[PDB]
Amino acid sequence: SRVKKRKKYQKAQKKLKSVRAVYSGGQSGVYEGEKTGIKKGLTRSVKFK
Amino acid sequence: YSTPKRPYESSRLDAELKLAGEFGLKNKKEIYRISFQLSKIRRAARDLLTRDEKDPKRLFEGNALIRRLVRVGVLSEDKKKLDYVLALKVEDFLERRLQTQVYKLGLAKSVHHARVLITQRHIAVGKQIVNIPSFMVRLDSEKHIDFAPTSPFGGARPGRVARRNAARKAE
Amino acid sequence: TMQRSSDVNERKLHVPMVDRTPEDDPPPFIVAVVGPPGTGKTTLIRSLVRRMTKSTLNDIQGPITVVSGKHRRLTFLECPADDLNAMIDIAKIADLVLLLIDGNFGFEMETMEFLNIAQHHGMPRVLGVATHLDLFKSQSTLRASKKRLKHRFWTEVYQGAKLFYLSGVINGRYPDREILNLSRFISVMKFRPLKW
Amino acid sequence: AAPHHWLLDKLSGCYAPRPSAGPHKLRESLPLIVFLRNRLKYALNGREVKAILMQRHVKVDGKVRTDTTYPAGFMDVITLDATNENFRLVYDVKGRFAVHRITDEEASYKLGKVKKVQLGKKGVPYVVTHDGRTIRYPDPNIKVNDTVKIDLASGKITDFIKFDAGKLVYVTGGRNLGRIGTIVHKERHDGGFDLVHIKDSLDNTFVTRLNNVFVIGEQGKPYISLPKG
Amino acid sequence: NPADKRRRLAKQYLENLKSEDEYNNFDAGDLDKDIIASRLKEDVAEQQGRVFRYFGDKLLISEAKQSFTRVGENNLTCISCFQPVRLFAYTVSKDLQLTKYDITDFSKRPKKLKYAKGGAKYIPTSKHEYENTTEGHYDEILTVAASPDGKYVVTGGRDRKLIVWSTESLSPVKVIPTKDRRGEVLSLAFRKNSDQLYASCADFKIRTYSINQFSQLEILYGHHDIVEDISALAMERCVTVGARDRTAMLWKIPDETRLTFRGGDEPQKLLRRWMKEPLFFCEGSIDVVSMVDDFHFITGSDNGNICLWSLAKKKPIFTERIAHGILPEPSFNDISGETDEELRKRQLQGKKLLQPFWITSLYAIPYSNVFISGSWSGSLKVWKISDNLRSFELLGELSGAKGVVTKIQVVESGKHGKEKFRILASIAKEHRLGRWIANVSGARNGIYSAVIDQ
Amino acid sequence: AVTIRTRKVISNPLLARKQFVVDVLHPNRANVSKDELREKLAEVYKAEKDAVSVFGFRTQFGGGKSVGFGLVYNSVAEAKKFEPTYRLVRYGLAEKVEKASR
RNA sequence: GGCCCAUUCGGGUCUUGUAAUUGGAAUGAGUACAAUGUAAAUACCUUAACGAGGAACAAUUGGAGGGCAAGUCUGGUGCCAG
Ligand SMILES: Nc1nc2c(ncn2[C@@H]2O[C@H](COP(=O)(O)OP(=O)(O)OP(=O)(O)O)[C@@H](O)[C@H]2O)c(=O)[nH]1
Ligand SMILES: [Mg+2]
Numbered sequence A: 001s002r003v004k005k006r007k008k009y010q011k012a013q014k015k016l017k018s019v020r021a022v023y024s025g026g027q028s029g030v031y032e033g034e035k036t037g038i039k040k041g042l043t044r045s046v047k048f049k
Numbered sequence B: 001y002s003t004p005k006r007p008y009e010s011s012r013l014d015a016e017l018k019l020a021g022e023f024g025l026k027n028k029k030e031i032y033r034i035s036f037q038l039s040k041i042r043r044a045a046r047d048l049l050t051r052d053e054k055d056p057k058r059l060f061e062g063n064a065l066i067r068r069l070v071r072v073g074v075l076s077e078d079k080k081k082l083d084y085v086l087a088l089k090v091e092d093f094l095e096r097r098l099q100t101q102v103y104k105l106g107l108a109k110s111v112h113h114a115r116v117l118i119t120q121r122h123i124a125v126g127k128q129i130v131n132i133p134s135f136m137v138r139l140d141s142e143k144h145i146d147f148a149p150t151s152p153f154g155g156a157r158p159g160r161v162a163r164r165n166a167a168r169k170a171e
Numbered sequence C: 001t002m003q004r005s006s007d008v009n010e011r012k013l014h015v016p017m018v019d020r021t022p023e024d025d026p027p028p029f030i031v032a033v034v035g036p037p038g039t040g041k042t043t044l045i046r047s048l049v050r051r052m053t054k055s056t057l058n059d060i061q062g063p064i065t066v067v068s069g070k071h072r073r074l075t076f077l078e079c080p081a082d083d084l085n086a087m088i089d090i091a092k093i094a095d096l097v098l099l100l101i102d103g104n105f106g107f108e109m110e111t112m113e114f115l116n117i118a119q120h121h122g123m124p125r126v127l128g129v130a131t132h133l134d135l136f137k138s139q140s141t142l143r144a145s146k147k148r149l150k151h152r153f154w155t156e157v158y159q160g161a162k163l164f165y166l167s168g169v170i171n172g173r174y175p176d177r178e179i180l181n182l183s184r185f186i187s188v189m190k191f192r193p194l195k196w
Numbered sequence D: 001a002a003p004h005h006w007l008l009d010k011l012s013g014c015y016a017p018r019p020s021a022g023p024h025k026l027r028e029s030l031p032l033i034v035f036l037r038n039r040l041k042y043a044l045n046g047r048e049v050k051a052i053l054m055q056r057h058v059k060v061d062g063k064v065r066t067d068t069t070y071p072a073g074f075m076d077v078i079t080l081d082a083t084n085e086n087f088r089l090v091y092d093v094k095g096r097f098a099v100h101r102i103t104d105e106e107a108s109y110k111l112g113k114v115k116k117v118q119l120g121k122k123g124v125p126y127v128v129t130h131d132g133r134t135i136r137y138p139d140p141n142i143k144v145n146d147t148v149k150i151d152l153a154s155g156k157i158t159d160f161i162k163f164d165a166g167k168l169v170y171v172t173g174g175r176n177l178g179r180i181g182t183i184v185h186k187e188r189h190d191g192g193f194d195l196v197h198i199k200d201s202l203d204n205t206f207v208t209r210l211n212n213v214f215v216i217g218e219q220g221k222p223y224i225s226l227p228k229g
Numbered sequence E: 001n002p003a004d005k006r007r008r009l010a011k012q013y014l015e016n017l018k019s020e021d022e023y024n025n026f027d028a029g030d031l032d033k034d035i036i037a038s039r040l041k042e043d044v045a046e047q048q049g050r051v052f053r054y055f056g057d058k059l060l061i062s063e064a065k066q067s068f069t070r071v072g073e074n075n076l077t078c079i080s081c082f083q084p085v086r087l088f089a090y091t092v093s094k095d096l097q098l099t100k101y102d103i104t105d106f107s108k109r110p111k112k113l114k115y116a117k118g119g120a121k122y123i124p125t126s127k128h129e130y131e132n133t134t135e136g137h138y139d140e141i142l143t144v145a146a147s148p149d150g151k152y153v154v155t156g157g158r159d160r161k162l163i164v165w166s167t168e169s170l171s172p173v174k175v176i177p178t179k180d181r182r183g184e185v186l187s188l189a190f191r192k193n194s195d196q197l198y199a200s201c202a203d204f205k206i207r208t209y210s211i212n213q214f215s216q217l218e219i220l221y222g223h224h225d226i227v228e229d230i231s232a233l234a235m236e237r238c239v240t241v242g243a244r245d246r247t248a249m250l251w252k253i254p255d256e257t258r259l260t261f262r263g264g265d266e267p268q269k270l271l272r273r274w275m276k277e278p279l280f281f282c283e284g285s286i287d288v289v290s291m292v293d294d295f296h297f298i299t300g301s302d303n304g305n306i307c308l309w310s311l312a313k314k315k316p317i318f319t320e321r322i323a324h325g326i327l328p329e330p331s332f333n334d335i336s337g338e339t340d341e342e343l344r345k346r347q348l349q350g351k352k353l354l355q356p357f358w359i360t361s362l363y364a365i366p367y368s369n370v371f372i373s374g375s376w377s378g379s380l381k382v383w384k385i386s387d388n389l390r391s392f393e394l395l396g397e398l399s400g401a402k403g404v405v406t407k408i409q410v411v412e413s414g415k416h417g418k419e420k421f422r423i424l425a426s427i428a429k430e431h432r433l434g435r436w437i438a439n440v441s442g443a444r445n446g447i448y449s450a451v452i453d454q
Numbered sequence F: 001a002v003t004i005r006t007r008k009v010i011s012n013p014l015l016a017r018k019q020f021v022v023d024v025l026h027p028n029r030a031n032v033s034k035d036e037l038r039e040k041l042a043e044v045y046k047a048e049k050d051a052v053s054v055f056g057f058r059t060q061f062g063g064g065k066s067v068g069f070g071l072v073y074n075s076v077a078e079a080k081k082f083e084p085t086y087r088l089v090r091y092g093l094a095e096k097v098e099k100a101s102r
Numbered sequence G: 001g002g003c004c005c006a007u008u009c010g011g012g013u014c015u016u017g018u019a020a021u022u023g024g025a026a027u028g029a030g031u032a033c034a035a036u037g038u039a040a041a042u043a044c045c046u047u048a049a050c051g052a053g054g055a056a057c058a059a060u061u062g063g064a065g066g067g068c069a070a071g072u073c074u075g076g077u078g079c080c081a082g
Helices: A002-019 B010-023 B028-050 B056-072 B098-105 B111-119 B160-170 C002-012 C042-053 C084-093 C109-120 C139-156 C176-187 D032-036 D046-055 E002-019 E028-039 E267-275 E341-346 F034-044 F076-082 F085-091
Strands: B123-125 B145-147 C029-034 C064-067 C073-078 C096-102 C125-131 C163-165 D078-080 D085-091 D097-101 D110-113 D147-150 D157-161 D168-171 D185-187 D195-197 D213-217 E065-070 E076-081 E088-093 E097-102 E111-117 E141-146 E152-157 E161-166 E172-177 E185-190 E196-201 E205-210 E215-221 E227-231 E237-242 E247-252 E257-262 E288-290 E296-300 E306-310 E318-320 E361-364 E370-374 E380-385 E392-398 E404-411 E421-428 E446-452 F003-012 F017-026 F052-054 F064-073
Touching: A002 B010, A002 B111, B010 B028, B028 B056, B056 E002, B098 B111, B098 B123, B098 B145, C029 C084, C029 C109, C042 C064, C042 C073, C042 C176, C084 C109, C096 C109, C096 C139, C109 C139, C125 C139, C125 C176, C139 C163, C163 C176, D032 D046, D046 F076, D097 E028, D110 D213, D147 D213, D157 D213, E028 F003, E076 E152, E076 E421, E076 E446, E088 E141, E088 E152, E097 E141, E097 E152, E141 E185, E152 E185, E185 E227, E196 E227, E205 E227, E215 F003, E215 F017, E237 E288, E247 E296, E288 E361, E296 E361, E370 E392, E370 E404, E370 E421, F003 F034, F017 F034, F034 F052, F034 F064, F064 F076
Parallel strands: C029 C073, C029 C096, C096 C125, C125 C163, E076 E141, E076 E404, E227 E288, E361 E404
Antiparallel strands: B123 B145, C064 C073, D078 D085, D085 D097, D110 D147, D147 D157, D168 D213, D185 D195, E065 E446, E076 E088, E088 E097, E097 E111, E141 E152, E152 E161, E161 E172, E185 E196, E196 E205, E205 E215, E227 E237, E237 E247, E247 E257, E288 E296, E296 E306, E306 E318, E361 E370, E370 E380, E380 E392, E404 E421, E421 E446, F003 F017, F017 F064, F052 F064
16 A cells, blocks of 8 residues: 555656646756757746736 | 545545655555644644633643644744644644654655665664654654664664575575 | 344345244254364264263264254264265255364365355255364464464355364363363254255 | 551552451551551561561560451550561551651550549459550549550559640541640530640641540650651 | 743642641651661662862962873873772873873872774774774774773773773773764763763763673663763762753663753843843853762853753753853954955954853862863863852962863872872863864873872 | 662561562673573672572563562571462472362 | 647647566564563563565455457448447
C-alpha cells in the first residue's frame, strides 16, 4: 500500500508539469535558452473580468 | 480516529494524494488519525476564543494549550497567541513525525528510505531505538535523532549481507 | 430487532424432504475414521471404544458397533489408508467422519481426496481430529498452526465445523479427558437426512 | 479492608490481617505483622516475620509473646533485643499510630487508664486498665479515668496520676482522636459530651467523652517522652 | 489585569489544595522514615555538603610568588593534578603530547618527568568506528583527568578515544573508543574520592566509566549543543554545560534525570533598568562550570558573565557581567583601508563592535569560599563568594599569565587555619577548541603557577 | 564486562542480614547472569558466597541496566534458615519435591 | 515519445519510458543459544547463530475497457448488423 502511493504521486507530479508550469528550482547552469520553443502568439495570462 | 464528512470528494482525494506522497504515508488512516486529534485540539481552542478575556478557563487553559503545543513543536516559541492554534493544520502535525524528521535531518535520502531505516531499527532518538515511523518527535528530541550504535550505519559491526559477502570473498 | 428476526427466521427454512429413518430402532450410525497412513486411527478407535465400553479392544479389525448413548449406538470402522477404493466406498456410506490430520505435517492429499469424494457423493457429518501436537518448544507455532488448520478445515466443511485437538499419546492411547469430551462431541451431532 | 490507624499503603494485598484477641480491642490496636513487616520494615513477608517471631526478638511489655496477630494497642512498649530497640507507640494528630523511639528507663514502665475499682471478693480492692492488668491494692482515692504507672518487671502500680482540672490529658476516640494540649476548659455533663477540653496552636476548643480521654502527666512535665517535628 | 488575576487565582488554588505551630507536631510517616534513616548505612558518598571552608578574605592575595614556567609545546590545553589523603600534575597539548610533572616541591617551579607523545603513527588502519582500539592519540588531545586515588591518568580528545595511562610509567593500559563518528570528548571529571569518570562527548552525550574495571556505566543524553564542560564532586550528581543552548544541566546519574537551568538576561530590560537614571547586553554561549558545593555552582559565559546558581532556582542567583574586560577595538590602520582617520573612525561605529573577553576557564575550589576565573585579559581574577551564598566579589588579580588560560585548578598545602595553595593555570596562545584568537599580545605557551599564602 | 552498583544499604539485625538494591550494568551483554552476579557481589562484599542472594530482576527496555534486590547474609547456616525454600532450590542446596497426587 | 484539456475541429506542454541489463548494502517475519522472569512453567523484557531476490519468505477485494480463431449462433436489400 505504500509503494502504490509512492508511484501514483510520482505520476501525479509528472502530470502537474503538463497542466501548470512548475518552478523547478531556477537557473541550473549557463542560460542555454528556452529548449522547447517560444510562441509569440499565445498569451497564457489571466485577464480580469 | 474517525472518517471525514464527505470522504470522497475530489479535493479530498487530491489532498490525501499530496499528503501521502509528500510524507510517505501508507494509507488514509495516518491523515485521518492525526487530523481527528487536531480537530479536537482546535475545536477546543475555538471555545477558548469564544469565551472572553480574563476568563479563568481562557487564561489557564490557553497558556497551557499553547505551551504544550510549543513543546510538541507544531507551534514556534514567539507566536504565543491562541489564534495560531486555529491557524494550525495537519501537515504541521505530520512534519513532526520521525520519518519526516529523519529525512529532513538527512540521515535518509527520501521519506521511504527514512521509513525503512526506522522499521529496520537504525534510528534511535536519545537512548531508545524508535522503530515505528509515526512518532511525533518533540522540540527537545529534535536534535538527538541519530543512527543507533547497534547499527552498521552508526559504528557497529556490519550486518549479515556485508559479513557473508566478506566471508565468501575471503573464500 | 424486527429486521434481525426476519433475517434469522429466514434461515430456518430448508428444502422439505422425506426422512426414511425410523424412530423406534434406528441403525447404528456409521462412524468412519479416515486418515493418511501413520496417524491416529487404530490408537483412536481403541481409545474411543475403551472409553465407551470399558473394554480394552486391542487388535481391531472390521466394523465395530458399540452402544454410546441411551438411544444412539454407532459403528466404528477404519479405512485402509492406501486404498482409494475403500476410501470411496466409506465416503458413500458413512454418516460421521472422524477426519485424522497430522497437525505437525499439515494437510494431506488423502484427507483432501476423501473430502472431495464425500462432497460429491453427499457430504456426511465431519468432525476433524488433529493429532501430533508435539510441534516443538514453540507453543507459539502450536497456536499458529492450530489456527491455520482450523481455517483451512473451515473452507472445506461448513464454516463452524468442529476441529478437535488431541495431545500426545500416553500409554498406548490418547488422554481420556480429550477422548471423553470427544465422545461428548460425537454424542450430540443431530444428523440430517441425505438423498442416495 | 483496612482501618485508618495502621498507616497501611493500599498497594499491599487483598486480605487484611485481623488481629487476634488480646489485651486491647480490635479497633484500637495494630498487630505485630502490620507493625514489623510493613511499617518499620524489619520483614518483607509473613513467612519471615513468623521466622523472627519464632526466633523471639519481640519483648512487648517485658514478655516475649511470640504471635503474628498480637494486638499491640496504646503505648505497649515494643522491645526488640537486637540494637536495643525500645518503641513506645502513641497516636499522632491525624489518627494513625505514631511509633516513637524511647530509651530503657522509659520502657521500664508504662501507664494505664483505670476503668473501674471493685470490691470483688474477699475484701480486696481492685483495678483494671486497657490491657487489663488486674493489679492488687491501690489507694482508696483511685477514681475512674486516673492513670496508674505499671512496674513492667513485676506488675505493681508505682506512681499515680490523679484526674482533675489542670492535668495533661491524651484523647483516643471520636473526632478528637490524638490531640494534646488539655486546657481551654473543663465541662462534666451528666451522660455525654463530658470532658476536659484541649487547646491548639491558636488555642481552639474541642469536645469529647470521658472514656475517650485519659491523662498522661502535668502541664509541662509528662514523664513520657513525646515525639516532635 | 490578567497576570494579576493569574497570580491571584494560583494563590487561591494553592490555598484550596492546602485545605484538601502547636505543641504536638509529630507525623507518623516522617518519623517512621527517620527510623529507617537511623537504620541505614552509607553516610559517606551522599553528603549534601555545604560550604564548610570559609576562608575567602582570610588568606593573602596581592603578593603571590608567581612563576610562569614556559614549556615548548604549542597550545597547551588541559591540566590535571592529584593529592593523596609527592604530588603529580599533568598537562596535555595540541602537539599530541601528555607530560607528567612533579609539583610537590612547593616553593619553586614544577619539574618535568615524562613525555607521552602520540602522532601520525597512531592513525588506525581501518577508518571504521569500532576498531578505534589503537594505543595512542592521532588528533588533538583535549582533556586529561587524574584519578582521585592516583593509579591512572585518563585522557582523550578529538580522536574520539579514551586512553587510560598508568601513573608510574605513562603507559596506555586500556583504550575505550566512543563508537561513533562525532564522538569527540571535550571534558572529563572524576567524581571525588572514587574511580568513576564522567566524560562529556560532542554527540550531546555524557558517558560514564569505572576506570579500574575498564567498564562503561551509563550513557546519558540531553543537551542541545556540544557539552563543552563538566564538573563533579563526591556525590553521584554531575553538572554539565552545553555551549550554545545556554543551559546548564545537573544529572542525577543513577536516576538518569536532570535539572535544567537556562540563562535569560536581556539588554532591553537591562538597559531600561539602567535607564531609570552602559555597555552590557545578552548572552552568547555558556562555556565552563565548577560545582562549588552540593547546592550551588558557577558558570562562565561567552559574554564574560560569571553567574552563581543554586540547586533550587531556575534563573541564576547572581551575575557578574564583565569579568575580564572588553577587548581592544581593531585599529584604524587595520579596519578600513581609506586614507583619512575620519572615515577610518567612522568605520568603528562608535562602541557597537566592542566585544568582551570570554571566560575560558573557571575553577571553584570544592566546598570553599573562593574561585578563580581566567581568559586572555592577561590577569587571572580571584573572587570570593559571600557567606550568605547569594553573591560573590572580586578579591584580587594574578597578573603574571600572558595568554589564554585553558585551565585553572589549585593545589592545597597547610593545615586547618594556616594554608597555602599553588594555582596552576595552563596558558596557551590559542583557545582549547578552535583557533579563533587574534592579537596574540605577548603570550607564551606555559604553566602559570602562583603560590598564594596564609 | 559487567558492572555493579549497590544502593540504599540497610542492616537487618533481626534477620542477620544486609539488604540493598542492585543496579546491574551490562552494556553490549544480554542480561544479568545471576550466578556470575552472585560471584561479583560476594567479592565486592565479604566472602559468604552461599549467603549472598538476589531475586528481583527487571531489565529496562533496550538493555543495559537491570534493577534487582540484593540481600547478603553472614553465617551460611542462618542464610539457609532465613531464605525461602524456592530460592534455595534455585541457587543453593535444598531440594524437596512435592508429593504428586490428585 | 509521454502527459493534460475539449461536443467538434483541434489545442497546451515537457526527460519520458522499458517483464532492458546490473550492483552491493539493509534488515524483518521465521528458525533458534541462552539467561531473566516465575512455586514451577507460559508470556513480556534482554539476547549470541542462521535467515531475501520470482527478495517464490508467492496480500486481497472490487471496478472500467478492450483485442483474437480456417470457431459457433441469429437476423437480411452481396463483403453487413448483432
Ligand atoms: N507422537 C505421537 N505418536 C502418535 C500419535 N498418534 C499415534 N501415534 C503413533 O502412530 C504410530 C503408528 O500406528 P497407528 O497410529 O496405530 O497408525 P494408524 O494411524 O492406524 O495408521 P496405519 O499405520 O496406516 O494403520 C503408533 O505406534 C503411535 O505411537 C500422537 O498423537 N502422537
Ligand atoms: Mg490402523
